[PDB]
């Protein structure tokens, strides 16, 4: 292969464009003076950023990573504060999984939510430090302290999310307080002792009794009086299942250049060290090990919910657990994660067959099963459901003259239209990315905000803390460091009319609803902005028509492209380079 280093970063609550223009563009503009870089591609979602730098075949993957990490270190201070705190990762690894380590609870004592935190808090790190382990993907989230804010109760006592956050930073602190008898000391000093002031909080109990304010009569407004307080995931996006029951697990990619077999064993040895100390019921299951396994991918059209993707994964699981009983030992299925990317609209299912010896006949081998499966799932509505083991072409349409996303889409659509008019050379020329979707656009009226004495900082923190969530600081949960997140309780951040129930305090102490200084409309925007070598782009996949070769099909695509609007370019990547 040609080695690929992958930068990954995150911005809680940001949209694709925000991500792209505050993170993606900034990293890319500084990825230079790096040896042997063939090309660079990137994604910015309405979740998160992936920049993939692909190097010349023969390149020393170590150096590529070091050089890359070093340029990212020099761009770090240009990125937003919110992004840096999440911590960017830079990884040299294959983009396929070596294996998946499933975790279930046979006694049913622990939910999906509880299991994933077990894995995050007790297993992931050790596996992550095992040699050969390039990337580790948790199928779930680690617990954070969740402060679920109520806007009705916040407005009742004239507080905002800004007040909550301020108090969480003041009362969930870890203070350096010096010592008694500390150096340099007076003559004859007999006592030396550490001073311990505030330490991090550890419980919901504790966070709940954070004191927000004293009313003028004397009563106390605590954080439990404007919020529900529970341990809950950092994100809620990824949920998994193992033969239909609640599960978490670890997708483990092999480090570029590592031994696949040795890495597998080392991972197994480290898991053997953990088992003794599991809670009653926890159990490791091994659903995908690389003639024996395959995956099944699920793409719903963008704008789809988690609930609807779960419906499709259930039919997928159901087919393997019922119609293919005698061949399938197990199905590990994940809502919210996809072979390429993340998001509420995708999903994947890892399938593990029974012993080769108990599946006699060419119709029960992996090729026949996957084919039957895909035939079976083609009868599913508004979902691309494709099951496959582990060559046509790979084309990037590039914005070469500042045209814009709206314009590059029309040029993409015009190229797709033309390619459809040659069934004899090109079949299923599809775009690899996603379509624009209804997004809620809200304008802050700066005049009214000023007239009323309402800070824009207090407005956008209120908007953003409530509807997107905000990582405030760290806390210790059973002795491990973890995040604290302030966000609105689900029910006050679901519908447009809820915008108007959030109040912001003015300079004169009066509460002002968002309604007063905001206005909103629907519009369309991208949920996944693509870039190829620094410029906006759109990846198009296709294959050569039957009894016609790659080169001829490519030659046609190249001709079709010359007739696109001024400033639209192209390039070949991946298999086509």
């Amino acid at each position: 292969a040609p080695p690929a280093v992958t930068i990954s970063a995150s911005y809680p609550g940001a949209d694709a464009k925000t991500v792209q223009d505050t993170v993606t563009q900034v990293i890319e503009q500084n990825m230079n003076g790096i040896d042997n870089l063939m090309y660079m591609s990137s994604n910015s979602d309405s979740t998160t950023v992936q920049i993939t730098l692909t190097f010349e075949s023969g390149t020393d993957a170590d150096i590529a990573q070091v050089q890359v990490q070093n340029k990212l270190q020099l761009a770090m201070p240009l990125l937003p504060q919110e992004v840096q705190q999440q911590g960017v990762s830079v990884e040299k690894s294959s983009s396929s999984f070596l294996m998946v380590v499933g975790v279930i609870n046979t006694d049913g004592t622990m939910t999906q939510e509880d299991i994933s935190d077990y894995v995050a808090a007790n297993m992931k790190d050790a596996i992550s430090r095992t040699s050969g382990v390039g990337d580790v993907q948790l199928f779930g989230s680690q617990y954070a302290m969740r402060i679920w804010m109520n806007p009705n109760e916040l407005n009742k006592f004239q507080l905002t999310p800004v007040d909550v956050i301020t108090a969480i930073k003041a009362q969930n602190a870890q203070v350096a307080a010096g010592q008694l008898g500390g150096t340099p000391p007076v003559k004859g000093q007999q006592l030396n002792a550490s001073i311990i002031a505030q330490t991090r909080l550890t419980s919901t109990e504790e966070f709940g009794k954070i004191l927000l304010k004293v009313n003028q009569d004397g009563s106390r407004v605590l954080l439990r009086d404007v919020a529900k307080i529970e341990l809950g995931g950092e994100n809620y996006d990824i949920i998994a299942e193992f033969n239909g029951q609640p599960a978490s697990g670890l997708g483990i990619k092999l480090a570029t250049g590592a031994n696949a077999l040795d890495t597998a064993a080392a991972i197994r040895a480290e898991l053997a060290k953990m088992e003794p100390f599991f809670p009653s019921g926890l159990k490791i299951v091994y659903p995908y090990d690389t003639q024996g396994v395959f995956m099944t991918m699920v793409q719903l059209p963008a704008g789809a919910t988690q609930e609807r993707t779960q419906k499709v994964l259930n039919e997928v699981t159901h087919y393997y657990l019922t119609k293919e009983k005698n061949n399938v030992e197990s199905v590990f299925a994940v809502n919210g994660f996809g072979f390429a990317g993340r998001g509420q609209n995708t999903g994947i299912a890892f399938v593990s067959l029974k012993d080769w010896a108990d599946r006699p006949g060419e119709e029960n081998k992996v090729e026949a099963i996957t084919m039957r499966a895909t035939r079976a799932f083609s009868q599913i509505k508004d979902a691309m459901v494709f099951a496959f083991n582990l060559t046509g072409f790979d084309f990037e349409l590039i914005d070469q003259a500042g045209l814009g996303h709206e314009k590059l889409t029309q040029a993409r659509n015009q190229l797709l239209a033309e390619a459809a008019k040659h069934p004899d050379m090109l079949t299923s020329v599809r775009p690899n990315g996603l379509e624009d979707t209804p997004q809620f656009k809200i304008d802050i009226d700066q005049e009214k905000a000023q007239a009323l004495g309402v800070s824009i900082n207090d407005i956008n923190t209120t908007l953003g803390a409530a509807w997107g969530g905000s990582y405030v600081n760290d806390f210790i949960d059973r002795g491990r460091v973890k995040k604290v997140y302030v966000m609105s309780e689900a029910k006050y951040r679901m519908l447009p009319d809820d915008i108007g129930d959030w109040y912001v305090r003015a300079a004169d102490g009066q509460m002002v609803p968002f309604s007063a200084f905001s206005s909103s409309r629907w519009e369309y925007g991208s949920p996944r902005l693509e870039r190829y070598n620094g410029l906006p782009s759109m990846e198009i996949l296709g294959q050569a028509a039957p009894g016609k070769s790659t080169g001829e099909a490519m030659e046609l695509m190249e001709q079709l492209a010359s007739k696109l609007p001024t400033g639209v370019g192209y390039d070949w990547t991946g298999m086509s380079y």
Partner: protein, 156 residues
Amino acid sequence: GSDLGKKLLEAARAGRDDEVRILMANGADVNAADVVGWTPLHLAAYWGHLEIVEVLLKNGADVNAYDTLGSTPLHLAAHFGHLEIVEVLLKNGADVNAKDDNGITPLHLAANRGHLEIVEVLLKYGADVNAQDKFGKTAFDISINNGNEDLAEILQ
């Protein structure tokens, strides 16, 4: 949102004129909304598909459809610079002084993006030039805040 509902909404969006004609002749609701209240006419007026806007209206589409925030297909056409479609909608009885939830009129939108030819077509069809959005603002006030003196001159 039924099956031939969704087929239409998506087809009105992508400009597949043939497919819109096909689905109309098989009884496809011309007032199929999506989760934000967009009828096909909204989609067509937004993404500048002139033929489909006529073809839907011809099959009795609601020219004054509201999305969930109060906004009509005319608003969309005015905002994004779709001159013929503004003309065509107003021809078929589009409310010239329709207000979304914010007090915003098609004129406000056309004005704010400086789409000067759309502004006149609108004024022509009866457009209350002293309309105010929720913050007291006229299409004049907008022209001043944008340094757009060609428009202030049209607004007199």
